[PDB]
Amino acid sequence: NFTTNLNQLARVGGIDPLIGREKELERAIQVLCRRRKNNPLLVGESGVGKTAIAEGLAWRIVQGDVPEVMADCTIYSLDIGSLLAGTKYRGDFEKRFKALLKQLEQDTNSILFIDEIHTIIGAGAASGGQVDAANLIKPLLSSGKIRVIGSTTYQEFSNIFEKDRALARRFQKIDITEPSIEETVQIINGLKPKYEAHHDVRYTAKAVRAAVELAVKYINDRHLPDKAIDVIDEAGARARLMPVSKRKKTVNVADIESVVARIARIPEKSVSQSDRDTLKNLGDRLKMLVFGQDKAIEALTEAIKMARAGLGHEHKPVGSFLFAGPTGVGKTEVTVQLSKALGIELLRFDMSEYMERHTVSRLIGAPPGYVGFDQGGLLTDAVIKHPHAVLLLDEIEKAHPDVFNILLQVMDNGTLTDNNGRKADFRNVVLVMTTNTERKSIGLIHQDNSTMEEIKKIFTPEFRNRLDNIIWFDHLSTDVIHQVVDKFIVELQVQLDQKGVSLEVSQEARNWLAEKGYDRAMGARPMARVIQDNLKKPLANELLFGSLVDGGQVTVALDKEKNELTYGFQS
Amino acid sequence: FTTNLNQLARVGGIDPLIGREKELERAIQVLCRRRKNNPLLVGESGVGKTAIAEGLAWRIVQGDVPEVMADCTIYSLDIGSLLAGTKYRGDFEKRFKALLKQLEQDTNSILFIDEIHTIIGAGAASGGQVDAANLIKPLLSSGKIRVIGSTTYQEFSNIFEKDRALARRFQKIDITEPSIEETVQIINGLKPKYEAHHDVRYTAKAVRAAVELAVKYINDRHLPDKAIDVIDEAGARARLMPVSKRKKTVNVADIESVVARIARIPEKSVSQSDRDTLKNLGDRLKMLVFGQDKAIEALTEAIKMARAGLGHEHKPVGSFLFAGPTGVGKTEVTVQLSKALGIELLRFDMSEYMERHTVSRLIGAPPGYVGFDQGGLLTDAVIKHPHAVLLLDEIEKAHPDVFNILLQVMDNGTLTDNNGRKADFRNVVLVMTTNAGVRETERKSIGLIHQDNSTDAMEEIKKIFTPEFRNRLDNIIWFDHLSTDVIHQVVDKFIVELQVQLDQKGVSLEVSQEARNWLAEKGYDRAMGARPMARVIQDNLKKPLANELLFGSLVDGGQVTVALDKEKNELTYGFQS
Amino acid sequence: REKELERAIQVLCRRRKNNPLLVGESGVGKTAIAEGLAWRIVQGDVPEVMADCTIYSLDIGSLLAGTKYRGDFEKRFKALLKQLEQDTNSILFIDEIHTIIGAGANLIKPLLSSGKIRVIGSTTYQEFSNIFEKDRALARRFQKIDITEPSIEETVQIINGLKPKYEAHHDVRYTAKAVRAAVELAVKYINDRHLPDKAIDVIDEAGARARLMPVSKRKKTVNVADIESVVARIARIPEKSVSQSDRDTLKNLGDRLKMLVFGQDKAIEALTEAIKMARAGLGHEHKPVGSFLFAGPTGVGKTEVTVQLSKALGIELLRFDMSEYMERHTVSRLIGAPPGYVGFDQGGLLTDAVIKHPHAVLLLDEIEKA
Amino acid sequence: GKTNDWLDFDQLAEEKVRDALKPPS
Ligand SMILES: Nc1ncnc2c1ncn2[C@@H]1O[C@H](COP(=O)(O)OP(=O)(O)OP(O)(O)=S)[C@@H](O)[C@H]1O
Ligand SMILES: Nc1ncnc2c1ncn2[C@@H]1O[C@H](COP(=O)(O)OP(=O)(O)OP(O)(O)=S)[C@@H](O)[C@H]1O
Ligand SMILES: Nc1ncnc2c1ncn2[C@@H]1O[C@H](COP(=O)(O)OP(=O)(O)OP(O)(O)=S)[C@@H](O)[C@H]1O
Ligand SMILES: Nc1ncnc2c1ncn2[C@@H]1O[C@H](COP(=O)(O)OP(=O)(O)O)[C@@H](O)[C@H]1O
Ligand SMILES: Nc1ncnc2c1ncn2[C@@H]1O[C@H](COP(=O)(O)OP(=O)(O)O)[C@@H](O)[C@H]1O
Ligand SMILES: Nc1ncnc2c1ncn2[C@@H]1O[C@H](COP(=O)(O)OP(=O)(O)O)[C@@H](O)[C@H]1O
Ligand SMILES: [Mg+2]
Ligand SMILES: [Mg+2]
């Protein structure tokens, strides 16, 4: 059972020098210089440089910048796959594990570095609940002169470690602090010449800072030390492959945007100088998909640009808004189009189902020891999955008062805590609250049910005061309604163009559809259903029976007396 | 030992690559990286994972690949050759490391490894005696030679992404089946080889129609796996079926016969079968199930509008809610709807998913759960039959979380599984049955005159089901109550079954027309439909006959005369020898 | 099997994946499909492309008898494969291919990849799913074929072909009506088994039963009564022509149950009528004899009638106290423990009890508490 | 109010094996 050597590798190559870990290195050295219980335990997280500390110690000894008492030591990295190989044998693990220790006794100054200690030290050969998993090393660690550098995550530390008190006392925890962007900027600088020599490229200072800053802003799943190098590594490969006779050896910020976007699974949102083009004409391109409530577009687009300019607050979301207008105006349409414009996902929730007292926990999750804990909360889960999406909450006024408190904490601090101990980042989510009857007037003679002080009455000042700006939506004007129905006719036209037909429909047909489709209270919600049956169903049957399969010509005819939409078919 | 696939491309034995251009750039991207430079292709079998590696060697010969890796000669290894000579003591390990030493001296090459899960899976894979998992780690850690692998979503999840060493060495690539149009081009490339082998000639429409139809009737493998086999099989079947006067010419009719045999159907498949089955969908369905003329007609119109294509391709073909009481033949039309359209049936009783935890089971439970090993029932069922019909009875009892998964299908037509595969719903129709409203409709009021008109049972539908969910639904089909004429046919159906069982014993059964009417009112309950008709027949008809059969005149097939008594208004049974 | 055999020949002629895999359920005639192929070669009905092609049936047991000190396994396979390959027309046939793939390694993977030699493999749907799907290399070369069941009329011909062997061994004569009865009766009642296997089991059993009754040679002719007896015995359907000895129990089941339990006559009538109905044959063939929910005041004979019913009918009472199964996890006891867990050794209490006593009354006391 | 759920914990059976060898000669 051979074990990889970390000093032989560093003397030939393949071991990258560790930078900026003076404090952690000194602690590991100090721990390894102890007489008893000299077994460091590099407790960290995923993506942080845990193995780097261990491999850094190897290049330090080779170079010689180590205390003479701690010199001449050879760090050995055992192959877990080798020891764990072989099964259904009474002594395979014992022979392999005790062979490594025996071959290590010959070198009384050698150090052992076991990566992923929890895998082999949690259950080595725990067949049928055997208790031999970690009992072999325990006497060796406390008494034996053999040292065992362990590296595990913080979560695994709690799940397995600290429960076996005997094993925990024989290990010295070494806490990692997840270095900040500034610390990571110096780390990538030292590694810049190494990557530049392999890819024969050059990285600009702007690109280095942009890559680390963009990864933390968008790549939340991975940690900063490893993910940042991933972007730099990928940009070098892409900077070399994409050029065709251009010979663009330099690596500008542009290449960084491409790789981060692709690895983040987003539609080009994480790009520099590209958003400014859309921000310049965000309202213009939005006005082509929405008709009316133009004043609302100005309030929404300015706040978005205000937040994107980097002048907002760090402990608050990009912007909290309370869209207020009668039902059907199109606040949801503005949001469903804003997300596609800004290249962000869309989160849609309805507070109608969260009006009970026990249903509020469905957003943040049930407390531990109660029903609903395992899956968690849909709100915090969706936010963690898409921290850049747009949050839409329909009919917020119906929500229970406890739910308002949850939103208050979000708008005040910009973060929520999941029932599993996670932290839902809200600093990059556009919070959108929509606020607004079907039953006829209860009177002898029916009457109109159409409906600044209204919001103050239905919303406490503490909630209103936390909003960035309350955008108002104007009632759909009669002239505007003619524009809205045109979008459905042209939408069907492009859909029908794929089949090969052209609808002759003119404003005469839209006249009846307008009043029938649009309602003052329901708004334009029945409008979609109108085309679904009146315009789509009749053409569908004839189009498929064979008359218009190989190219078709259709038309519309509305008779005053019939008060219905007739159709004409040709081919 | 190893085979230099790169050399084969220079020789010209390898074939050109048709498609998968985007995937090829990703492989080149990873290889140029200093770290995490080992590509990993994870996909289902038949997607053509190995085609990408084979094609990669071909492009280097052309020189389009960057000159940085032009000199690189991609190699390949087969575990079969390595596994040989098992009797020798560690020859498998001894000869594998020797190969690396040869490759290390060159220090410039890539090594394709088909079914890499086996090498890393030292005993994890079924019948695995390989111990090369540890062997690869030294070469990969040094980084002198890159490796390209191949695995599936099942193995990748259970094995890959767990070991940190593999996570920082192999990069996940999402190989996906190509477009239908792309599949046609691939067949065109291999035309001279396949045609020359069988000395046959098939037209463009034959291979084109084959891919569009093979997907419908075949599910065991991906798109460009059966298609390459179907044309091969068609040429082989054509070569040998004629004893003489060989019909080398291949037309659309010939491919229809071979696919029918493997499909195990009685020639119903056709190139435009969908258009033919849709026109005669209404008339061929009403005959099978009596009644529900208004509901059946509405359902047929919805499927026609969807197939027309004037909508959203991502949305499912149809979302229908079969409202109304049970026992009105709602499940029957669903059963016959699939049989008419030549598709399978996937019945799921949602009454067993009345808890929040069970909801996760549908899309895959967390590790260590019984459902997790099996996988998501909804996703696995759809993958096994992407054209069948989904039936979810008693949706009003299901947890509100279940609606969330259904929303993703009706809004996106795709449900990501924990394994990572994406389900296809654009060709699946979902039909839900609910009894909500019937209880309220039959709720007699507190008054002298019963409020006979209590059909305003839509509020309950809206109350139980959130507006968001029902909003997407196309139409809430309301099933009517069977008329006395239909009920009479149902009684005859149960009577015929009884007569058939009785005929095996030599016993006839005569039932008057008036007696049947008595069973109609008692057998059919407005709140329960015609479901109690099977129980009333057992209690009113089978019980008296059983006593006479065991000990009586009916011991050996004598006679039966069932007649209703007008004075008592009760069924009377006459027994004769 | 003219359509099933056609599938094998066409795939064999294919340039690639020329390895027919006859995947079918147990007792479906999978070996007959390949055994029948050899017959047609001599007759010459097979297409000329594959005419004059030898078929070799490999014996796993013969090759497994390794005499050499661990060198026989590889030497036997290596020499055997070359003998079949040099001819270039032989199409090897391996029944129960799953055994060869499993360690006992195979060393036949290079041969399969080259495709120079065609090998036919038979395997059950169970084993095919467990191992062949995992190894894409092995299952890629093999093209899964589907064999579900033969036609009803064709089965009668197969029985006639095999009838002389059974008649000679049992010294009995099977009437044409009896054979048709067995096929029709067996398929209708024994749903779990398949038409080819069960059809020959009843025929073999029917002959033994007739010969065994008389000490001397007699009862040569076999009547449909025996076929009904053996098919009913395996299917467990209540046999017709009930004996007068058993016509007293059912006749006096209510009177006996009324003496032990007084009152609540409706409960006794429902139970006795359902039991009598089942014996008559006018009962569901896919549902229990009777599902009855007994509710009422305390001490009204709800449990007593069930216990006495078992005693009167002389069948074991599988009494289960549902109060124990309050929790969902307790369901494992009834359905069964998982295959790999610690309790896998213990079987399902409900499943094992029902298997041990198929006709036993099942009493689920206090079902609501479950 | 609320319902306090209970999480059952499963136990898995894993057993070691020993090999009785046969001398070749
Ligand atoms: N001003 C508009 N311009 C374009 N399309 C519109 C407009 N208003 C409504 N629509 C269309 O009508 C559809 C249905 O309206 P909804 O989006 O459901 O309304 P809503 O969000 O409930 O209304 P409020 O007033 O925002 S609560 C939208 O999705 C659009 O397709
Ligand atoms: N088409 C057929 N022609 C002739 N005999 C047939 C045919 N189909 C089935 N049989 C008979 O079925 C029997 C053969 O069964 P086998 O195929 O050997 O069963 P098997 O595959 O070994 O069964 P298991 O359960 O899978 S081990 C013989 O009695 C055959 O004569
Ligand atoms: N109808 C009855 N005729 C004769 N003995 C009876 C009758 N009902 C109850 N007993 C007697 O009362 C005792 C209990 O009867 P069981 O039928 O076991 O009660 P049970 O119906 O299970 O009770 P609970 O309280 O409803 S669970 C025994 O001694 C029975 O013999
Ligand atoms: N401080 C650092 N200096 C240099 N490289 C670092 C540093 N922190 C992390 N890395 C790099 O992180 C990469 C991947 O993570 P690694 O350091 O192996 O830790 P882990 O095994 O915990 O993921 C290594 O290639 C290593 O060079
Ligand atoms: N894009 C493609 N270009 C060329 N050949 C392809 C393509 N996709 C599939 N094929 C061919 O179809 C078959 C696909 O087999 P494949 O899925 O690679 O097998 P496996 O899953 O065992 O690796 C091969 O014959 C392959 O050459
Ligand atoms: N319109 C109908 N035409 C023919 N048979 C019908 C019709 N409606 C109901 N039935 C029959 O009545 C019964 C309806 O209840 P069933 O579907 O058996 O209930 P469940 O789904 O609860 O098992 C079935 O036997 C069904 O075939
Ligand atoms: Mg590491
Ligand atoms: Mg391949």
Ligand SMILES: [Mg+2]
């Ligand atoms: Mg029904």
Ligand SMILES: [Mg+2]
């Ligand atoms: Mg056999």
Ligand SMILES: [Mg+2]
């Ligand atoms: Mg009791």
